[PDB]
Amino acid sequence: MPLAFCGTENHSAAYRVDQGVLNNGCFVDALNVVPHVFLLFITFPILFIGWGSQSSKVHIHHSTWLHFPGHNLRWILTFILLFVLVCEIAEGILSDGVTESRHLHLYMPAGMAFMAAITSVVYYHNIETSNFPKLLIALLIYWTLAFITKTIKFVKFYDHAIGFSQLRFCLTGLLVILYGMLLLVEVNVIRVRRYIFFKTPREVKPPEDLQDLGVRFLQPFVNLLSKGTYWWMNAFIKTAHKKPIDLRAIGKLPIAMRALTNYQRLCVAFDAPQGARAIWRALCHAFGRRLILSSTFRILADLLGFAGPLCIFGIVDHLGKENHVFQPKTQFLGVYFVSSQEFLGNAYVLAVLLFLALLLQRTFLQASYYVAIETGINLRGAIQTKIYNKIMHLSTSNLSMGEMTAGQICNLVAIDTNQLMWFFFLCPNLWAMPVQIIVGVILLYYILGVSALIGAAVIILLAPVQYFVATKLSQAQRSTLEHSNERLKQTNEMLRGMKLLKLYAWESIFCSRVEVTRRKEMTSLRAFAVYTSISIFMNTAIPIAAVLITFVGHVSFFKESDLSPSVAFASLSLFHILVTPLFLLSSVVRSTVKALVSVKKLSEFLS
Amino acid sequence: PWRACTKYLSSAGILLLSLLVFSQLLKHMVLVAIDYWLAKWTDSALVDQSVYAMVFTLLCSLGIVLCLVTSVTVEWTGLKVAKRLHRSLLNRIILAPMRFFETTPLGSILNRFSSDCNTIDQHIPSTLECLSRSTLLCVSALTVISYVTPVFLVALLPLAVVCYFIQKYFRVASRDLQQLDDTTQLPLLSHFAETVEGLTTIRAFRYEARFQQKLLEYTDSNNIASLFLTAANRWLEVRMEYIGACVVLIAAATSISNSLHRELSAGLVGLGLT
Amino acid sequence: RARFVSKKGNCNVAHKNIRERGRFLQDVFTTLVDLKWPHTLLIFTMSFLCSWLLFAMVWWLIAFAHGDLAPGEGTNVPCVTSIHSFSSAFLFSIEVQVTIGFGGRMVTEECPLAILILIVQNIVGLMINAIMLGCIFMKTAQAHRRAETLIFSKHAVITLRHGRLCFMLRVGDLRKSMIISATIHMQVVRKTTSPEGEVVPLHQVDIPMENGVGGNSIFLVAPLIIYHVIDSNSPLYDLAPSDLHHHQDLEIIVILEGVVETTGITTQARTSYLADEILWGQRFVPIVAEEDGRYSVDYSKFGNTVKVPTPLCTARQLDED
Amino acid sequence: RARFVSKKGNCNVAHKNIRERGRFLQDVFTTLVDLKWPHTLLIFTMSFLCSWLLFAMVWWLIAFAHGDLAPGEGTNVPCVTSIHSFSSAFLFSIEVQVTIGFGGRMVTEECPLAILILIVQNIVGLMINAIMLGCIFMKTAQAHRRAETLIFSKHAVITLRHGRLCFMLRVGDLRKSMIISATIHMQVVRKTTSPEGEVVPLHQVDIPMENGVGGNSIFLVAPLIIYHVIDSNSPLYDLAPSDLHHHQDLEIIVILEGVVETTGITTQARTSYLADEILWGQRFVPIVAEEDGRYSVDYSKFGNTVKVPTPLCTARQLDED
Ligand SMILES: CCCCC/C=C/C/C=C\C/C=C/C/C=C/CCCC(=O)O[C@H](COC(=O)CCCCCCCCCCCCCCCCC)COP(=O)(O)O[C@@H]1[C@H](O)[C@H](O)[C@@H](OP(=O)(O)O)[C@H](OP(=O)(O)O)[C@H]1O
Ligand SMILES: CCCCC/C=C/C/C=C\C/C=C/C/C=C/CCCC(=O)O[C@H](COC(=O)CCCCCCCCCCCCCCCCC)COP(=O)(O)O[C@@H]1[C@H](O)[C@H](O)[C@@H](OP(=O)(O)O)[C@H](OP(=O)(O)O)[C@H]1O
Ligand SMILES: CCCCC/C=C/C/C=C\C/C=C/C/C=C\CCCC(=O)O[C@H](COC(=O)CCCCCCCCCCCCCCCCC)COP(=O)(O)O[C@@H]1[C@H](O)[C@H](O)[C@@H](OP(=O)(O)O)[C@H](OP(=O)(O)O)[C@H]1O
Ligand SMILES: *[C@@H]1O[C@H](CO)[C@@H](O)[C@H](O)[C@H]1NC(C)=O
Ligand SMILES: [K+]
Ligand SMILES: [K+]
Ligand SMILES: [K+]
Ligand SMILES: [K+]
């Protein structure tokens, strides 16, 4: 039984092409390899000739590039395409293992589609960087061929009464959609960036920025993948080890977010009084269309967070069940089809799906962080411009004193606008916490029932405790600062003058009350320290209590069946990914009230 | 870096420092056992201390109490070493030569006496405690995977090597970015300090356009340092997450193979994956 | 420092920030021949191997569509005889394209599409055969390797000849064959600032060599002394022996271009003499003798120089006496 | 207006009313190689395909005349074995001419005419194989495509150098390989009327460039500035900055000719600077720098110019002061 594309069953009767070639399942699958080998045989000669040929003495670096229309959509579709093909390869392998012979047509065409899909992304990116809109025809031909050959396979399933119950029917259907949409994207760039059919090759309109302006922060210009992996910074850090950085290598800020363009929109939104309520409306209008983007990534990252425990729950149940019996129980044209329920039954499938689920989740939460921070510092620059404008011109007839208060203004831009900035750093965090919490407890209730409710309730009740000790900790430092300032003031009376204070030999008695001035502050340090230690075992040791109140409660008050490893670890995993997003909840609440004071302070000091 | 950190144990002495090492190491070891017994109990649940497994709960009850005392054991000692550092600096300050004080700027001493000691008091013991539990938990997490499958550790070591290189290139770049962010922080607020005084000497005499635009030079230099520092952190986390996510796939695939290769394991595998 | 041209003729210049990749893509053949040998072998191998695979799938596919892969009974004439699996199709593709034609796997007259592919493969096979075989011979027969047997002196010499200072060097040819239409070009490479303030980092000033009928023409069969007379209009007219130290920013480039007699392709041999590689109080030693009825050239003493009494003044000062 | 030579080197001249078509017919090979690639592929394809068809009919015909096409009984040795229809004859012609030779269809020793055709087809097959394969390699290895990597400046400059106005431009080579025996020719193309009344619509006046040993010879490995000194006998001796507008009828052509080192075939790169493409008060910015031990050329700043103080008077007025 050697390797066979169509499998060696009967007398290799699966190779017969009577009653039409397109009615032979293997031939249609073989026909689907045609687009993929076409893409490899076209792009590889082109990629090698223009990109991989000259090196080590000929540098063709492009420090300027314009994305083709639909760049973001194309990368999104390919990532979906790459994910679906992985499912199709995994689906094929499960069906293939049942038969005595290996049917290569089940996964090899999908496996070779995976290489072509990656190559298309690589081919497109190199073309897109160096314009070459004419070379997009190769992708245009590839998508058309792939769409045609996947439509044929999908149609033949419909003829052979292959419903949505069979997973391979669904995966093929999605590929028709994904190839169809990618075909439209290629048509879209022809319309927007006419380069072949029309006789007017519309001007590329090079970006206003990204010229030789010294811009080194390439985050808003790199491709979508590099935005999610920060690959552009990798080269910058690769040389930062060799040479210390400076304000010159760090370059200039991109035009869209230097300082003024942030303030320019800020004052534009102000057109609508200038009270606290009016301030929030402008900030929401100016920095809301970008803030929701960070929250949306955070929400999706939170949703995929549960994909950890769910895969943990799925893998253990189908692993501890032993049995090891695998049968698709669905054979069409002599080919086994695995149902959707059976597909999510194999441990290997769950492990691979979990691995892909994590990568999307980890990237999304990182993407949520940067967008919030980038928007946060964008507001910080705009706010500082507004504050400076308030102090400067357009502030005629100053009220009295030394401009209200010299000290107040100094800390207003020092430790008050930062609180507003840090509010936007954690603004999605507060919004996304309830969504993760409510789904987390619900999933716990569907795993351990009553016992999970008690374990989740105490963790929820810990949030007021964490805020309660936060106020005590904050007050302790406030009392400490009153004594520390006296200790600092007493010490900083001849400390700077110790060059001449020691000459008079009067420091022998001066450095005798230092302990007294420090003990009055150390006793406040003890109050601050005990509160910190209180928060430690109220945070580090609380997961242990949560596990016990859920575990031993299965018989103390629940009286149910013996817990399985799957339900125990799934709740343990859910608890682990739930306790950690609680410390931020206490912190964001403390930051929320702190920022609310700061914005009120800015609003009242605005006029 | 950290080469001179071999000292500073004198403030912690010997009995106090060893107690923290013994306590901190104990907590992680018990938590490893607590999860291990949970896996064995659940494995034994589906079928001899099988009766209601309160011994494991009792072992879990002492851990939190042992964790409770560890929380203050490392915190109380941190206060005393601050006192000893405060005492040691005070004696040197009194005995500091006047000629050396005159030659030196005598301002760094005041900053070191006040700013550095304040960081040592309220921050360093907390950061060291958090570092100790994190650097120990990962090692413990790098041993439970070995216990569930001694085959995973074959490729675990090369991944940790890549993690070492990534970390080595981040701390160098991040610290320099921290310096620049600290460097650019001073002119921004000092300009505002110069703005509140002599503003009438600026408004009447000058068009004020230069001074306002001069701030934009300060803010831009400040903003770029902030986001470059942010981007370096985001760069670090992503490559760290991908290493972590890759570890999960290797651990899961190896653990599944053993169960299907007649290596038992059973519910013990699910413990390592968490 | 850095050298504009290495002693072996390699040019130490790196081209950076080129933003015209379209030009390289439009010039494909020059790129193909300019590749290093390990890449040329890979491209040569992958050009034929991928061609065989591409048509192997086509031969396999049409045999599938015709039902030839199915062993069900007989009485059916296949498109190509004795094709069973992809390996048979791949072997058949090699036989057709390399024109081996064993005949166990033979095209039959039943499938016009198969005859169509046979026409296409042969036409495509010939074009790939023509370009690749010709390309690898051009790669082999490049004339730059002939320049490895053209040797220059390791040191240049400035000395008095016929009352005027002359920058002399020796160039020889190791091979028995000739360099047809050999030409010598000598240039001075240094940073020169015009009075208007313009600065040229590598201003190449072309200097003449004394030939008697002009210049840029030699008959190189025995090692010649190529020398440039330093006079009022020469760039070296203000060169002093103190200037001949390592860090001077003064480089002399010698270029020898001619048609290789054996091959017929023009070649080019280059060399450079920095400031510290030029000797002031020296003179080349004769290396041409007469043994029996055939002159013998002793290449062992090729670069040897012997000190001679030479004034330590510049060529400008010599005219002023 | 119209351009005599495009910025990319294309010549915008159309030849009209040629009544000597016999000259083109008498020169066939140059026509064959000068065809565009789609025509070259068609001729290459149709040369072999028609050759196979022509002998396919001959093989089919003599098999007909010998009775081989008739399946009546056996005991008769055919001219060529296993030939039944024209498709069999066509397949046999491909096997013989491309020298595949499967052997299912084989020449036998019964028909001397068949042996005669086998001799004729092989001789004709070799000549077509020799000419066409060699022709398509010459088409591929043309040296004009190498000129696509010889960039010129997009603007010319007329600044002051050494006290005299100089028409300057920059020429560079992107490839690592060299241009052997590179020569630069600069010409002025405009309509000049002699005093006798003769008018030359495109009188090409050849202008020299300063080289120091004559001219028409450069060593192009780094981007050189090629400049012509405007003096009494120069054609630009009466050129004023007011004349550098679009509608002036004044064009400068730069020609770079040399042997491609990689290939061995002489190439030619051309460019033209109209009146409005010449900048008066400008000067090229240096781009050659030294990094470590290797000079680095920054091609991003290739054509950039910086304004410099230059008199607004013609070179004629400069001599008159
Ligand atoms: C019981 C079993 C017994 C076994 C016994 C073993 C038996 C082993 C069997 C047979 C092989 C031994 C064969 C002996 C052959 C000599 C070939 C003669 C042609 C020939 O010239 O090739 C030679 C030798 O290399 C090869 O052999 C390269 C030959 C081409 C390789 C093609 C292989 C195809 C790969 C396909 C495989 C994958 C196919 C996949 C199949 C599956 C598909 C479905 C190439 O060597 P070279 O000298 O020309 O190259 C050097 C070198 O590359 C330097 O880098 C280069 O420096 P630069 O150019 O300056 O940068 C030198 O230049 P210089 O002249 O200035 O110094 C060159 O001189
Ligand atoms: C179940 C079935 C499955 C089917 C799957 C499909 C399977 C499809 C199967 C097989 C074919 C795909 C083959 C893949 C081949 C690559 C060939 C490699 C050789 C090769 O180089 O050919 C390439 C590709 O074109 C062809 O392919 C042309 C190849 C020659 C075509 C000969 C065909 C013979 C026709 C006979 C038919 C009629 C026969 C009648 C029979 C009956 C007789 C009784 C030629 O392309 P090129 O790049 O050299 O040409 C361009 C282009 O022409 C531009 O116009 C030209 O501009 P200019 O020269 O400046 O005017 C460009 O010049 P630049 O360099 O300056 O940019 C050239 O670069
Ligand atoms: C059944 C499955 C069938 C699978 C096989 C398919 C068989 C079917 C076969 C052939 C057809 C599929 C053909 C792909 C289709 C359409 C491509 C059209 C785009 C195109 O025109 O190609 C060229 C690139 O030249 C090459 O590299 C072209 C290089 C050759 C391209 C084909 C490679 C041939 C080898 C492939 C075969 C390999 C076989 C083995 C290798 C044989 C080696 C002899 C365009 O690219 P470009 O860079 O020249 O154009 C740029 C660009 O357009 C700019 O916007 C434009 O303005 P500026 O840059 O500002 O001046 C300029 O335009 P110009 O080109 O006019 O100067 C250029 O700068
Ligand atoms: C062929 O195999 C199928 C199994 O799908 C079954 O009908 C039987 O075993 C064989 N039938 C014939 C007619 O050979
Ligand atoms: K044969
Ligand atoms: K042959
Ligand atoms: K043969
Ligand atoms: K035979």
Residue numbers in the entry:
A (entry chain E): 1 to 272, 281 to 615
B (entry chain E): 997 to 1043, 1060 to 1286
C (entry chain A), D (entry chain B): 32 to 352
Publication excerpt:
ATP-sensitive potassium (KATP) channels, composed of four pore-lining Kir6.2 subunits and four regulatory sulfonylurea receptor 1 (SUR1) subunits, control insulin secretion in pancreatic β-cells. KATP channel opening is stimulated by PIP2 and inhibited by ATP. Mutations that increase channel opening by PIP2 reduce ATP inhibition and cause neonatal diabetes. In addition to adenine nucleotides-dependent regulation, membrane phosphoinositides participate in the gating activation of KATP channels, as they do all other eukaryotic Kir channels.
Here, we present the cryoEM structure of the KATP channel harboring the neonatal diabetes Q52R mutation (hereinafter referred to as the SUR1/Kir6.2Q52R channel) in an open conformation bound to amphipathic molecules consistent with natural C18:0/C20:4 long-chain PI(4,5)P2. First, C18:0/C20:4 PI(4,5)P2 is the dominant species in the brain PIP2 present in our sample (~75%), and both amphipathic molecule densities have map features for the phospho-head groups as well as long acyl chains consistent with C18:0/C20:4 PI(4,5)P2 (monomer ID PT5). These were best modeled by the common phospholipids phosphatidylethanolamine and phosphatidylserine. The structure of the PIP2-bound SUR1/Kir6.2Q52R channel has an open Kir6.2 inner helix gate. In the PIP2-bound open SUR1/Kir6.2Q52R structure, the two NBDs of SUR1 are not well resolved; in particular, NBD2 is highly dynamic with a local resolution > 5 Å. However, the two NBDs are clearly separated, as predicted since no MgATP or MgADP was added to the sample.
